[PDB]
Enzyme design. Sequence first.
Site, mmCIF file in Angstrom:
data_model
loop_
_atom_site.group_PDB
_atom_site.id
_atom_site.type_symbol
_atom_site.label_atom_id
_atom_site.label_comp_id
_atom_site.label_asym_id
_atom_site.label_seq_id
_atom_site.Cartn_x
_atom_site.Cartn_y
_atom_site.Cartn_z
ATOM 1 N N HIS A 83 15.276 28.556 -39.089
ATOM 2 C CA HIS A 83 14.181 27.607 -39.309
ATOM 3 C C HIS A 83 12.948 28.428 -39.700
ATOM 4 C CE1 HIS A 83 13.513 28.321 -34.917
ATOM 5 N NE2 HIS A 83 12.258 27.977 -35.135
ATOM 6 N N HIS A 85 9.913 29.237 -38.424
ATOM 7 C CA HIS A 85 8.944 29.911 -37.574
ATOM 8 C C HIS A 85 9.067 31.434 -37.705
ATOM 9 C CE1 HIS A 85 8.660 26.189 -34.702
ATOM 10 N NE2 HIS A 85 7.710 26.148 -35.624
ATOM 11 N N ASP A 87 9.606 33.803 -35.497
ATOM 12 C CA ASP A 87 10.730 34.523 -34.900
ATOM 13 C C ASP A 87 12.006 34.405 -35.734
ATOM 14 O OD1 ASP A 87 10.459 31.796 -34.046
ATOM 15 O OD2 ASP A 87 11.656 32.133 -32.240
ATOM 16 N N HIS A 148 14.252 21.190 -32.028
ATOM 17 C CA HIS A 148 13.150 22.141 -31.906
ATOM 18 C C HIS A 148 12.229 22.075 -33.124
ATOM 19 C CE1 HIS A 148 11.080 26.022 -31.267
ATOM 20 N NE2 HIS A 148 11.282 26.187 -32.563
ATOM 21 N N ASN A 179 6.300 25.037 -25.531
ATOM 22 C CA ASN A 179 5.703 24.708 -26.817
ATOM 23 C C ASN A 179 6.727 24.013 -27.708
ATOM 24 O OD1 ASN A 179 4.527 24.854 -29.529
ATOM 25 N ND2 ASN A 179 3.017 26.234 -28.593
HETATM 26 C C1 LIG Z 1 10.274 31.498 -25.943
HETATM 27 C C2 LIG Z 1 9.524 30.426 -25.764
HETATM 28 C C3 LIG Z 1 8.037 30.480 -26.083
HETATM 29 C C4 LIG Z 1 7.688 29.651 -27.322
HETATM 30 N N1 LIG Z 1 8.232 30.324 -28.498
HETATM 31 C C5 LIG Z 1 7.715 31.387 -29.092
HETATM 32 C C6 LIG Z 1 8.544 31.714 -30.161
HETATM 33 N N2 LIG Z 1 9.529 30.835 -30.152
HETATM 34 C C7 LIG Z 1 9.342 29.995 -29.143
HETATM 35 C C8 LIG Z 1 10.259 28.829 -28.793
HETATM 36 O O1 LIG Z 1 9.903 27.980 -27.915
HETATM 37 O O2 LIG Z 1 11.377 28.722 -29.375
HETATM 38 ZN ZN LIG Z 2 10.819 27.881 -33.617
HETATM 39 ZN ZN LIG Z 3 11.608 30.337 -31.063
#
Ligand SMILES: C=CCCn1ccnc1C(=O)O
Ligand SMILES: [Zn+2]
Ligand SMILES: [Zn+2]
Length: 231
Positions: A83, A85, A87, A148, A179
């Site tokens: 996705h 984001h 990460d 998500h 989040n």
């Molecule tokens: C790891 C959880 C903190 C929030 N977060 C930060 C990065 N990705 C996430 C997620 O919720 O998937």
């Molecule tokens: Zn994400």
């Molecule tokens: Zn994440």
Amino acid sequence: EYPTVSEIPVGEVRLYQIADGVWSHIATQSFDGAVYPSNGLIVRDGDELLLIDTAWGAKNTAALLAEIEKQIGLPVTRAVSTHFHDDRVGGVDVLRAAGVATYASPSTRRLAEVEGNEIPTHSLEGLSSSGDAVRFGPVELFYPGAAHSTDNLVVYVPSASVLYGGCAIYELSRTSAGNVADADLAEWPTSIERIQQHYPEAQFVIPGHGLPGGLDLLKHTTNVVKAHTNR
Ligand SMILES: C=CCCn1ccnc1C(=O)O
Ligand SMILES: [Zn+2]
Ligand SMILES: [Zn+2]
């Protein structure tokens, strides 16, 4: 033993062997004042490697490539981001500079652009509707529907019954939704049910963050999400 957030300084990456030719990669990153761990996948693809998701940032992703070369020694030739984001796509520019062909769905590429994140080069076709699946070398990519995020994909390794759930699946120890600014809370349970119907044989289930488990992580994630929608 699976590496934990406190064992990985930000900037370092660990590889964890799940099965023959299947590894997770684990990195750490700061987010909203705290440091969190993050998982991706590595799958042997003949004489090459298929990477699922970056290691959350340019520096981590460069460390991921160095660790793969050190420990496995086969070339990473393709990457899929599950996705939009950071990460998942943060580090796509490093992968591209290193020779890796990067991929994501058309929605993911679009949402990455809107967000100002790095953009994988190639569009994955055949994933636009909930329930769609496509083969991609040694894995199947599956779009379960919004959860998500609206674009989130999951990945299955048939050869080893490994289900990579990405950020739509929580680890067991995570009990609050946290989040979810981009989540579809109403659809998330339905999306998880589609995962369960389509991969009832999964033996290993890897969340986007934290400890691997089994199909219990799905029921666990629906509980967390539902509890959060209640109030
Ligand atoms: C790891 C959880 C903190 C929030 N977060 C930060 C990065 N990705 C996430 C997620 O919720 O998937
Ligand atoms: Zn994400
Ligand atoms: Zn994440």
